[model samples]
Target: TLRAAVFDLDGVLALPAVFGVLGRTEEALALPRGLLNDAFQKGGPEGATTRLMKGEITLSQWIPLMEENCRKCSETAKVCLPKNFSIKEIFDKAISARKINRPMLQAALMLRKKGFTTAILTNTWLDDRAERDGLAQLMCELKMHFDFLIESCQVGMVKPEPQIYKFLLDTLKASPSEVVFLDDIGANLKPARDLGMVTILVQDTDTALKELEKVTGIQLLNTPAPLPTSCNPSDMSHGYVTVKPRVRLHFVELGSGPAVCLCHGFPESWYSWRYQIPALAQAGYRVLAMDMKGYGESSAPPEIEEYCMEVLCKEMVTFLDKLGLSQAVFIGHDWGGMLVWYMALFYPERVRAVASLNTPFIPANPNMSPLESIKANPVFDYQLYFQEPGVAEAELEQNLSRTFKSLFRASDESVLSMHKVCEAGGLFVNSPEEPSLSRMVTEEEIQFYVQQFKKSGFRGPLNWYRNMERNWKWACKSLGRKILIPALMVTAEKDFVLVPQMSQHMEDWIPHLKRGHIEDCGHWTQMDKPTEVNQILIKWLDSDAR
Candidate 1:
């Protein structure tokens, strides 16, 4: 009986991780086709590669050896590597280019559903480079679909070693014969087979799983990909909730008490509320941070008008209703803040209280469309680019991670000057270069977000920008009505896009509101200063309504 099925990460689930870097490395050296594998041979499997995979050596040490090996493999005695080639840069490109084999991923999910345990046993390490691709953070993203994850780097062991297989069997509490291990490399599988485990070499993902099924009776293969969830097994687990009847919005939830819904802005997942959810949950509120429609795991409508403010606020109302809450507190940031504004306006009876971060609410104009207004005002020079579809998506999609890092500005970073591609000290357009992400976000935390976007493309998120006029038209109905609910509006000290001045009139309109500010923060106030944000939230929720 097959109790568990173990799979490898790189070759079986994805393409060669090295190829992304090698393709560039090759052109620089004018080296031959197989120099990458040669790097492994010369690095001495017994030495650099194994030590690196075992977390005994950092990637910084490993790459210099490979460069030395590349020089040896070159035909010319004096070879020219890229002028100041950074191994970190090349590795980052490999990860950013890394994509999963959907068929294999779905097949693995099907195996777990069949009641056989799904596990990943890989001879890999997560250094700073893998974090750039977001895989370092994505282990949890990858772990959501599996029952167990054992990495050689974490366990101090490498594959093709009997000890590693023994470690896996011990962890799963299974005998070797009960394990059916699938791996792309033969050397790794041979040791598992020797330990009396059934081994399937994954050459053709479909064919390989097919053969394994016939051998083990574990009916494993399927079409439509499975829904992904949060990696953490503790309080905040990720899942999708069906609201507005059938629309499933993915959420990250924690604790058990009265509900407090969290809504995020553009280009972010529920992760945007990472700090607040746990704190709120501990403060005796059921905190649910959402991906917002079309942005995270939620259903993304293809039509532009499908994301208007009416549809968004209605979804929030329905989510609380379905959860058996007649009234719940809402905390919103960015576009999410814009949402709670309308929620307070449209569903006063349903909201206990509300708080907003960064996004400010403006009264609708009876005469103008939202697009015509923003484009006409040069105050939004960037929105001029966003109003046109495909223009920004194409440039941003060119390097999703790079796009994320650029758009998510931290206090001490500078990028996207497009210095090399720019003819003037200005910007027009160019194909995006390979991207890397860092700053403000941890390598693991940021990649989890990247993994979510990789699943759902950037178009759905951009629809919010597309629906500017549609949302404004919906907002017109309640134009003169006051948001009578108790509200708190927080502004960032450094956000130029949604300047603090935009909310100066907020108190006049909101009537009962608390105004505060985050010092030295940007558009990502919650993430920038989570502890500070949490303190403000607790104080307001604990306060009597003004």
Candidate 2:
């Protein structure tokens, strides 16, 4: 009865290394599609790979041999030449882009949690003692699901060798009959199969996992497929920022122009700027998209007061200060948009201009606190639910994807009544006829949103909504103060919760406001009509406002 499982690392437990840096490599070197694989995996055991796996050769030593062995560009028979950097440098950069097999990791974790032992049997090489210190750091930097790590570099044996299989079996104190092996390379599986060990050759991650499921009689592999590479939301470059008075906030930086900051709203991360970052960067603005406090990689202070509108706006000022910029334009969505509105109001000297998506600048009514203001209205019952600590958290934290499905959807105001936001568990339970995927987002988009939300949780985003009454203390100072800086408010006419009426007073409060509207979109306008949003963004943000 198969009681133990073993897995190969590259192309099985992780993505192919070359793909991680293909775009840069293609641009940096005039390299071809097959250059890396061609040069790297030409021979079997007794080849350069086996030699490297045995620690007999260094990466630097083997690259030149690989250079000689590399395939030519597609159009020509002559090999492509390395241009800006060494071929080795390109390989190193690819290593940094290592995409962990999350589904496999999940499966492996469930297996071990259920009392079965699992292990990694692989071939690797490390140049220095430090690299050797983390013999399994490949998975160490990510989800390490295996109980024990066995590597050829330490054992002087390589995959496709029967001896290594014998060694693994003896070490686990188990027979081949008790083991199952999964690998990407077919040659490595023949011996395992001959030895009476079950084998699953991983051609496609989903397909292989499905076949393995049939063999094991376990129901696994339930995650939806990822979005296409073209619209990768969480693929932005990362940077860490911390001011003297606060903890670190992680951000995604793009372009080289004058700084333009991006902040996200409730239940969303910096991925909210998936459409804006590169478009703004290409349109000649340095884009700084952040996972604002308690979202994504940013710091989340536990106290309710830490997420106040004034506190975050001032923190934005300090974030720029730490980045060596005294002034920069700011853009935000949802609650982030609300915060930047306050940033402009509270720190006028620091804001060059300000813009927001969907969430309009609602001036603080001096007579009543926001909680009082919204409770008097009919639509904001969700805020009433979010105000209590455990209510929304327990409901949302229980099934995040269900909640996200309710929030992210495509609509023109026509269907507003049908999918009218539910006041209480609206996030988790919505009208049945209402759909999930907006014209703007796909299944992959939903997958990533759920991914980050699970890791970061709803505490930070909800904390903003929780500070409604408390925020009034800070909101009091800016009452009757006009936003003197140039402002752009892109409204979604069909948004149910933040209806068009909410934005009618912008001109009275914002003397320089340039209000625009997305005619057929809902609250998720940036995603619903991303290209249209980017078009409006580039025009308004870079335009000279009188």
Candidate 3:
């Protein structure tokens, strides 16, 4: 059962008047002021517009500021604009903008049905009188759906601030762990997340609803399975290679020039570099995407040692030898990111250039233990679970579809949602019933993933978790070795899995590193925001570097 769900009022609930004011401000920044004269002129302090919508400033304070500006402009024969704008007009425009209240209403109703408490937190400046009568009527008309509403102006505090969040936590007599706050702004959500509140960013209403279902264990949508496509034996020759030992290695071969190879992270396959593959290929380079040993169509060996960095690094070198390719550009993400660092150290001659997404390579000393190296990152809790006896295989087998959906976000909510099921001595310890998976993943995608897992149970993939110490020892041998080749690192600003601080010490490790950051995206960088990720990759890869 769920505890509470908190929604931001401005963008998440009913429309507010400030949106039009912001639009007008944006227009003022772009076109001439004459274009917005009519709407801009009628906006005034103490009007119904200012009363109903929480204005950013109080009428007492705003009226004086606007009056002073108006007087100065009027003396110079300029326009005198009103203090506040009409929220109703803004709501009308928002309606035109296709803002929907039905989904939010449904979400609130669903939460109520599940016996979950609901609340709203908003930044507004409306007075008590207006809030009691005007806002109450507005909520009634829209079927307002919160048990409690918190206005920043009333509380004298706003989001992204611990105080306001603490206020909500105190008011409800609930611990931070008991509440989940959903907002569109990362700034607002970050504080709640830091305070230990589960946070979800609403990029899309449907996506948010799906995430809510994942958190609350409610199935809100009936997802359809992906249509089956015939597998052509010849199509398998697209670029993948099957070693004589029967190890199926998935690879992508493109372009006619220099060769570059890419590796994906844990829980990801060769398809992860779909954007980078075609881009590099088009740029006069042969691009090869490798499905790391345990993922995709690659061979999943039972020996845990096979997943070790020493073995995996050798496999990469042997792969180049198998294709008769002398050397190539290498790129990696997450665990693959760790591998690229290993490749740069163990097989420098085989790497012409290197790139990493999210993960940073911290040189470990020979004396360092794997537990010590990985203990710093609590976010890798999933890896710890994978290493436990029969946990990964059993939990994943029970609910393949849901597990895939839960991997979408890089937030505390996502972490807690999974933790509740699979953390603290595994999912079986808590409940005998299998936890329901979220609908974030399409049925077809889930089926596709399940089919791949069916070919080889999770033992092969889980071995990656068991080899951290091996990777540590292997990487420790090359401590203080600088990457001579030009290197690039991209950090996702919103990625909780590999937080921003993880890459801060890159200069300390790699001497020749160029760093970039992407905003409003998560762990699945390529898939989450393809266009932005692709543009950055193309730009960096095309840049002239010595």
Most lDDT-accurate candidate: 1
Worst 10 residues of 3 by lDDT: 224-233
Write the number of the candidate with greater TM-score, choosing between 2 and 3: 2
Question: Model 2: per-residue lDDT, tens digit, 1-546?
Answer: 878878887777777534346455655565666555545665756567668887788655776766655543332556546444465666665665566776776666656656668888877775543233232445553333467789888898887888999999988788998887898888888899999999999877898888777776666678443221123444457899885455688888887777888878777888877877767776678888888988877887777888877778777888888888978888888888888888888888888888888888776778876767886777676677677786677767876666676667676423233223344345445334434455566677778888887776877778888777668888888776898788998888777777878888888888768877888777776677677788888898778321
List TM-scores for all candidates, in order. 0.55, 0.56, 0.53
Which candidate order results from sorting by TM-score in descending order? 2, 1, 3
Candidate 3 achieves a global lDDT of 0.66
lDDT of 3 by residue, 384-478 (tens): 67766576778766666555655644332253333433347563444334334433334555566666667776777778788777777666677
Q: Flag regions of model 2 displaced more than 4 Å.
A: 1-235, 244-246, 412-426, 430-438
lDDT of 3 at 166: 86
Q: Any idea what lDDT model 1 has?
A: 0.73
User: In model 2, what is the error at residue 295, expressed in angstroms?
Assistant: 0.2
TM-score winner: 2
Better of 1 and 3 by TM-score: 1
Q: In candidate 1, what are the lDDT values of residues 1-546, reduced to their tens digit?
A: 787888888767766544446655665656565565556566455767788889887776777876776666654444455566655676777766676766777777777767788789988764754354366434544676788989898898888878888899989899988888988888889999998999998877889879877977766665443333223524457766687544688888776666788899977888777767756765667888888998767888677766778887888787777767788887898888988888888898988888889888788888987767775655465655566667666765766666676656565453444332223322234423443454566567766767778765877777777777677777888977988778898888877668788889877788777888888887777777777788788788778331
